[model samples]
Target: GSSGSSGLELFPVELEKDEDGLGISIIGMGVGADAGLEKLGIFVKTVTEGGAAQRDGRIQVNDQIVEVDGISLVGVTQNFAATVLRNTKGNVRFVIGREKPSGPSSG
Candidate 1:
């Protein structure tokens, strides 16, 4: 793998709603008022403060979910994008190609 690459980054992220919940939340639908071109994945924009996505170090913030259990959430209905993962079952506990735009550029 090459570092210093100015391209998109993908990940093999997997997680099931724990005793509490997946404790994750996404942002941007890629097809609305701020949809980077109206065709991309839904990003993991929010997290349970001090949760795995933030402090524990499981998934990052910018990494958007592309597909899960062979179901494409990109540019699809909000039902698929949100519920698919939020209510994902055990059998369908599958892969989610996460897309993060470069690195952090904040404080």
Candidate 2:
């Protein structure tokens, strides 16, 4: 259990937004097998400055958003996923997936 440079590996990150919004943007073409981690959901395309996401300082670019509030963002259209995000309120829980960095960083 050391390294495997293959497929989408998953992780979790959660955050809450402000009255000014989450200061983020999301993008994904589709969901499920055609999609990504947990075989699911949209990816964080960008994070703007001075926002909750950036301030909390964990959510990064290209992190696939698998769930919001433990609700599946999988198996839906991109807009549908966006819809859920928009409808979500307070204490957003996001299960994200990013690439597993293989090999050693001790170079």
Candidate 3:
């Protein structure tokens, strides 16, 4: 099931030690406010195959990152988030949140 507006689905991802780097990338970052979200968050646009995120089998497309290393990402910029991740050492932890699906539906 997908995350709904009433609740946020939380996912904890740990990246393995790699000589190259983490195999995940950030495609989009929340600016100001969008949809119905009250705060800003980082959105996972894609996950590379065989990458840490993919290998972990937790991160997914459309998943919005709400926190990193227990640091709240609300109202943070994309560059800021990227810098944090880039400078981070060792295993990294990510907290993802998603908005409830919105569209016309028959109920």
Candidate 4:
């Protein structure tokens, strides 16, 4: 289910400040082989229905988060990724990769 090294696609989503002056509502997951403990890349588990990422529509379910705000998240843990999102004040640039589809195998 890996997208390989060159399959990554970058997407920029502007998180506007809400009444509380923060706009981030994304669920991070460090599951799967591509983003396992060995790889340490956080993946998008879910996006809030009316949140910034969902409203933009570029972020998807299996998109692996490679970078956040120009900071490399390649070897970062889920906790670290969450913390980064929580601390960011303005718009965030997320570099992600959608897993390439695998065709049926011939026996």
Candidate 5:
């Protein structure tokens, strides 16, 4: 998913299954966001549907994925994140943080 504040920074989501056999599905980074792996304060948002993410339930709307396969996203670039996901052919692992009402917080 993408962020409303910075359109360049995108939230990352890995699908458990491909939709429409297209080998690709819709990934949300909130309402107005872009696809980047290592943007410090942005995250991907989820919709309440039985799609890949909803089915897995590991991540949700307002959740920020802080790591991929144990690699910290602290200094990673959008292109680097994309490369990570792209390089991973299957079953990618992620460390996610859920947003709180008080603002951004991670677990």
Candidate 6:
């Protein structure tokens, strides 16, 4: 059974606030091949401070994106990876494994 929602929807991303209060663009997921998964895709680790992603707060780190903007990023050519990401300007959607928030901290 699948773990995440399967669909494409544009979600707004917000820039994270740094100590200095500077804005930064999100370092979008990188596409790569993994033998275990048998696919090539990007992993969203950290959304840049003051970037579109930080504001959205939906996507999180450790999420394995299988597709983007209706395109399957797996097994795509290197040049094509960039294309997939840039297909849409200013907005993007992804299929991700959102880690469920743990219960209240013990402390």
lDDT of each: 0.59, 0.73, 0.68, 0.63, 0.48, 0.48
What TM-score does structure 5 among the candidates reach? 0.47
Q: Which structure is stronger by lDDT: 2 or 6?
A: 2
Residues 1-107 of candidate 4: C-alpha lDDT, one tens digit per residue: 97544544565544554544333344444444443445566777776666666667777665676777776666677778778777666566777766555688778
Residue lDDT tens for model 1, 13-69 = 556555555666777565443544456457777678865445545566655566665
Kindly provide the TM-score of model 4 when superposed on the true structure, using C-alpha atoms.
0.64
Q: List candidate 1 stretches off by more than 4 Å.
A: 1-7, 31-37, 52-56, 90-107
Which one wins on TM-score? 2
State the TM-score for model 2: 0.72
Comparing 3 and 4 by TM-score, which wins? 3
TM-scores across all candidates? Answer: 0.57, 0.72, 0.68, 0.64, 0.47, 0.48
Candidate 6 residue runs with Cα over 4 Å from true position: 1-37, 77-79, 99-107
Candidate 5 segments exceeding 4 Å error: 1-42, 45-50, 99-107
Query: What ranking of all candidate models by TM-score puts the best one first?
Result: 2, 3, 4, 1, 6, 5
lDDT of 1 at 107: 71
TM-score of 3: 0.68
**Model 6: ten consecutive residues of lowest lDDT:** 20-29
Q: Which candidate has the highest lDDT of all?
A: 2
Q: Please provide, for model 2 over 1-107, each residue's C-alpha lDDT reduced to its tens digit, 9 standing for 90 to 100.
A: 99544466655667786886677888874543532543345878888887778898788877777777787776666787788788767778777766677687985
Candidate 4 yields a Cα-based lDDT of 0.63
Clashes of 4: 0
- Shift in Å, residue 38, candidate 1: 3.3
Better of 1 and 6 by TM-score: 1
Kindly report which residue stretches of model 3 are placed more than 4 angstroms away from their true locations once superposed.
Answer: 1-6, 31-38, 98-107
**Lowest lDDT 10-residue stretch of candidate 2:** 31-40
Winner by lDDT between candidate 5 and candidate 2: 2
